[PDB]
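Lab notebook page, bench 4
Experiment: in silico fold of construct C2
Operator: M.H.
Input chain length: 647 residues
Purpose: comparison with the prior construct
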Amino acid sequence: SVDETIPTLCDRVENSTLISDRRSAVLGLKAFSRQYRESVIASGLKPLLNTLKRDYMDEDSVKAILETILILFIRGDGHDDLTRGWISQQSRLQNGKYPSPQVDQFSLWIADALTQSEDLIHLLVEFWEIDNFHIRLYTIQLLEAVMATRPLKARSALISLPTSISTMVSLLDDMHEPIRDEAILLLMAVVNDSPHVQKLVAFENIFERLFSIIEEEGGLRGSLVVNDCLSLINNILKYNTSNQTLFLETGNLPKLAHLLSEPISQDEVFFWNDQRIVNINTALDIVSLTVEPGNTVTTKHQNALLDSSVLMVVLRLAFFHNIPKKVRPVALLTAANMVRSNEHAQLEFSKIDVPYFDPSLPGPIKLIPVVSILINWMLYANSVHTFDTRVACSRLLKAYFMDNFDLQRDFLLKQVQLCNNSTNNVKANLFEVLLNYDAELNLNPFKLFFTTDIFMFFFQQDHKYSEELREITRNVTTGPLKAIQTISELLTTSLTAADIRIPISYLTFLIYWLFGDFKATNDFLSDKSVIKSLLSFSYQIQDEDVTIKCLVTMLLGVAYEFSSKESPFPRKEYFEFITKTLGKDNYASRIKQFKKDSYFSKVDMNEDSILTPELDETGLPKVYFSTYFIQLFNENIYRIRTALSHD
């Protein structure tokens, strides 16, 4: 009745004479496939698969068996015993861009069974030649299921039949739209992480076909199917430089440009929702994939991109007033990938000016150069939901300067003149923030974080003439007191106060500045008054958080490491001063503790962690250290622990 019924039905499936009584047993097995799934798989799968191989020509036979296998795939709680929604969600979760939020051993049993040889897979592919809508569509969905569970075998078996990817791509043209839609899902999966299937699709006019579908479905207005089309374009381009050249050299850039412009080029307002935000962010991400950083052709692709309207539409997206807060950063970051390290792009960038508005705020129209409005937002657009934008502003500027010394050196000199031109007269200045006391700096701590971060950017000692850029910053003049000593007073004032990010930002900046720089160490050592305050601060009762006490003692330590006997506080003496108070044993124990058990130990080594950062119990991002600081430390942890030890 469970175990007399299924074995008997399995029997008639294989051993009946006439194709009718076989098919009929399959219906009977189908009948038991929800309640007795695991038994039917066990007793029934091989016979189901054999009479499929055998009756492959009989449409009713094939339809009933594909229905039975899909039913069997998972034990679903849902209206669809074939679990078809689940299958599409897997295709998207596994291979799709920006997905929105079950499988067992028995699922895997069916997946293995269907990939034992390429026999079954080839057969499934041959079913796309059948005039039956339902067979063509079950075939796709069953392959989505196998692909969701044994991608490697399913893909291997697919590529070993040469036409499969052509006939797969040809399904975009199917008369019945459901087939077009699933086919996008299947191609997403089959193409993902497969240079071979990336090469194979590039031959099939896949970009022209997919843009066509997208324009037919309404571009950004246009729900999942557009999202899926953009997911497939993404998956075809990802880490495939030839695919990327072909994309760029095949008239796809006007069609991206048109798609990205819909919110802008409206006469009538473009309303947004979660879907339209995912669509345009994937569209923007696709631009980014062409300009893979660290790759031979990146500059060639950047120039390709600059040749088209794309930089202008991406930038109009970034500086349009009614752009969603979750799109603005992606626009800016994309603009970064186009401009980064490109003399012509960098130069082109410098010329563009923009109607000013404040993205962070819940009338004459004055225009300002982009560089100034990026700096302005990065420093003063202090709002919970602008933090992703501020970080992107950071990155666009770094991309704008990157590998262009003339622009850096030019930029600093105009920036000091603006600090010394407020002294000459008796908001986008990095020296203003770095060097002046702000009473309300705890209200907007990231202003300093971003400022120290970009200075550490310019100051990298591999930047060919870092020395030139340091010097200009070093001899800056508040009052008669030079940058480092003026920094140190703000540092020492800040230690006492309440927000923990401000000390960390200054402490790490000065450690960064001084490390390797004999002139910077002298300037720091020029006035003991500070060395005394830090040393006194180093003797505190920690209250169970210690990160600053370790940074303070590391700064004393690093400054000792670059001492020399010609220092305003000579090495041999400054040694005694730190040794007699703090001690060699405490010092190396504080450096060790900084790595092992501080906010630095909690650093997320993921280079893009800052784009999707954790919020704390304030609602403020858990961002503390600049990447430059982090590298410098990791890269030289030994020498620093060893500063006082050597002698």
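Observations: Strands lie at 353-355, 367-369, 477-478, 481-482. The CA atoms of residues 77 and 83 lie 9 Å apart.
Next step: discuss at group meeting.
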